[PDB]
Design a protein around this ligand. Sequence first.
Ligand SMILES: C[C@]12CCc3c(ccc4cc(O)ccc34)[C@@H]1CCC2=O
Ligand SMILES: C[C@]12CCc3c(ccc4cc(O)ccc34)[C@@H]1CCC2=O
Lengths: 123, 124
Amino acid sequence: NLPTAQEVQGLMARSIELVDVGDIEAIVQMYADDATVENPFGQPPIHGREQIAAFYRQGLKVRACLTGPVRASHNGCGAMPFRVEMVWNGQPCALDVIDVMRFDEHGRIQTMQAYWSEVNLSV
Amino acid sequence: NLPTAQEVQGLMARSIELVDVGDIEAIVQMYADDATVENPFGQPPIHGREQIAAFYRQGLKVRACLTGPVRASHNGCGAMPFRVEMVWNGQPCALDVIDVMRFDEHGRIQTMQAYWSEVNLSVR
Ligand SMILES: C[C@]12CCc3c(ccc4cc(O)ccc34)[C@@H]1CCC2=O
Ligand SMILES: C[C@]12CCc3c(ccc4cc(O)ccc34)[C@@H]1CCC2=O
């Protein structure tokens, strides 16, 4: 069914865990089959598990950790802050992001928007 | 004009400053005259500076701090995480919230959605 707020906090937290270990198969299975991802928010969205797989394939040594609790609503949505560590121009950099997700009635991510820009990038 | 990413970070951070001191007039001014706020996200929205003034008068001893940096996009939007401290019938508590805001070409908040629920509430 439409995930409760507690359920949303556990799913959002698990998607960051899966990113962190680079488990592309498990990541893409968290998404609805026709989910849309906008990352960064403002850019054209990508649609469908195929494209979202390709995204993570290309994007993912990269680490990612929640930097605070997940915030969850009563209508299936929530938002979380996290930090991605990865290489930029040959040095270790960090990028601060917040992801906003809405879930469908099967508990899968229907949409994700990832808020970040170069102002959030640090060497 | 449409606020740049760095501008967004400044405006969103100023909004938490003005909540934290409780300056109702000043908070309300940061919003468009016909702004919509959904707080909490999922409830019916409140429209217009006047209903948003009433929200803050009713809601604001209350403190609020950013608990990490503002994430800003290039299309006048940003999100930020912060914590609100308050007292709910004698019980000190804290609530973690993330606000997502979309600014208009005058640098005022056109929409705000506040993400949280009771799962985000904590005693003391
Ligand atoms: C793609 C990326 C690594 C992973 C990642 C980025 C940005 C936003 C994300 C949001 C997510 O929910 C998960 C992963 C990322 C980085 C931007 C530059 C890059 O190295
Ligand atoms: C309204 C409130 C104090 C301020 C506040 C709440 C929730 C979300 C907020 C979002 C903001 O952008 C600014 C203030 C609040 C609390 C709910 C219980 C309480 O009294």
